[PDB]
Write a structure and sequence with these properties.
Two copies of one chain form a homodimer. Chain A has helices at residues 15-18, 21-28, 65-79, 97-103, 121-127, 143-154, 187-190, 194-212, 214-218, 224-237, and strands at residues 2-7, 32-37, 51-52, 62-63, 84-94, 108-112, 130-133, 179-180, 183-184. The first copy, chain A, is an alpha/beta fold and 239 residues long. The interface between A and B is large, with 85 and 85 residues. The structure holds S-adenosylmethionine (2 copies).
């Protein structure tokens, strides 16, 4: 069971994870609960203003402090004690599978989604526990990053359901038909030999990591078998 | 003008970008067009089967080849000549702002969204031009990655509308009120001095990059002004 509070100007976006696929089933079955608060609903002016001008000028707008702060405090009260508050931002800790495993240890999170140029620095200081980025690129809002985080952590919730699992890229996979545009399925996978198949998959994962993302292998303490299969793949490449 | 074809089992997820915010306005105004095809609609069996068992066993399922291949070919025909076909996968090129700028050079892309354990390796060989990842973590499907890519590239389309822009994290931003939980807005930003403000923002970007993501600075050819402001920030830190 995991509870995620979300602060967003566009809560309907979250239907993309709550209504579809494995995450949607997690939500319908109560394995994951996602509750949203919208800063617009905390405004008091006639036109429900949710942006504000940055001090110092420059182009762009910021989220208005009062509606956003009020929304955050409502979510914190709903979460009760022990909920970590995360702000999605490219200035935050870059998400990776280790970071996903750490976040999945939380039974409650509140995810704050910015729009426009972002949010006031002092709200980060006073209301946010951690800032997290989904990658070194800039999106229009924090909603896709928050949904990405939700989706990645939800995979760890028992009952909801490997690249980076053991630190390696996944092996190639094949299904019917046996021959596709003259390309055949590797016969080892048709052999029925479980141990040969296991080794092939592991060797492929090693080879693909080495060729595509060699920096990922630096970080790893390979097993003796992995060292051997990696050496075999590298010799085949040099042949 | 940019055209994006999407192949997905859950095309309704894309409402999250087509109906909301800056990307939603881009779609309504015809700056961005997003067209979806669903492999389910290309099935012929009574129960519209879209998954299939992997050769070699192991847990999990793959996308079924025939419906997915047929959907891809329909999208390719709709795109006409010159559309790059991308498969979203953690085995692909990790997206970053340089990669976003390169993808934004395409007037047409087709984005293939996998589910389950993925897709047959031979379809990658025969139908996919490039594989791209949004980060080193595993999600339940390619839809959030495809939407992330769409959102990031859409920011480059003229008329739709900085971290990583010049390679640096953004500076902190402040809006009303002047004092928030006893934290005051930096007086330079209230000074009205454009050149002082510009320098402060740049120095803050340098400082924040250095402290949070020092590896990003390695990659940069700093200007003389940036070298100076970075040195000032580092001396203030050592004081
Ligand atoms: C246009 S961005 C704000 C851009 C601002 N100039 C900056 O670089 O931080 C709008 C919202 O999307 C969130 N956002 C953009 N890219 C993100 C990313 N890669 N990871 C997490 N959140 C992101 C931001 O933190 C911000 O609240
Ligand atoms: C459960 S993942 C497939 C996992 C498979 N064992 C692997 O590691 O490649 C399901 C779909 O989501 C896409 N996906 C998962 N994480 C992604 C990421 N970080 N970037 C892009 N696509 C991703 C996949 O390529 C796949 O088609």
């Amino acid at each position: 069971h995991m509870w995620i509070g979300v602060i967003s100007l566009f809560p309907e976006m979250f239907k993309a994870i709550t209504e579809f696929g494995v995450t949607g089933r997690a939500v319908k079955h109560n394995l994951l609960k996602v509750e949203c608060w919208n800063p617009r609903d905390f405004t008091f002016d006639k036109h429900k203003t949710v942006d504000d001008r940055p001090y110092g000028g420059g182009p762009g707008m910021l989220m208005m402090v009062q509606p956003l702060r009020d929304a955050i405090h409502t979510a914190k009260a709903a979460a009760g004690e022990g909920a970590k508050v995360i702000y999605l931002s490219p200035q935050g800790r870059k998400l990776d599978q280790g970071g996903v495993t750490e976040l999945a240890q939380n039974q409650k999170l509140i995810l704050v989604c910015g729009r426009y140029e972002g949010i006031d620095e002092r709200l980060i200081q006073t209301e946010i526990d951690e800032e997290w980025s989904i990658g070194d690129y800039v999106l229009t809002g924090g909603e896709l990053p928050a949904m990405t985080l939700i989706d990645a952590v939800a995979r760890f919730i028992p009952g909801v359901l490997d690249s980076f699992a053991d630190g390696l890229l996944d092996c190639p996979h094949y299904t019917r038909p046996e021959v596709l545009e003259g390309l055949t399925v590797p016969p080892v996978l048709m052999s029925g030999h479980h141990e040969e198949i296991r080794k092939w998959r592991l060797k492929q994962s090693l080879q693909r990591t080495w060729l595509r993302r060699p920096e990922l292998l630096e970080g790893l303490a390979l097993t003796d078998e992995q060292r051997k299969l990696l050496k075999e793949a590298q010799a085949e490449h040099n042949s």
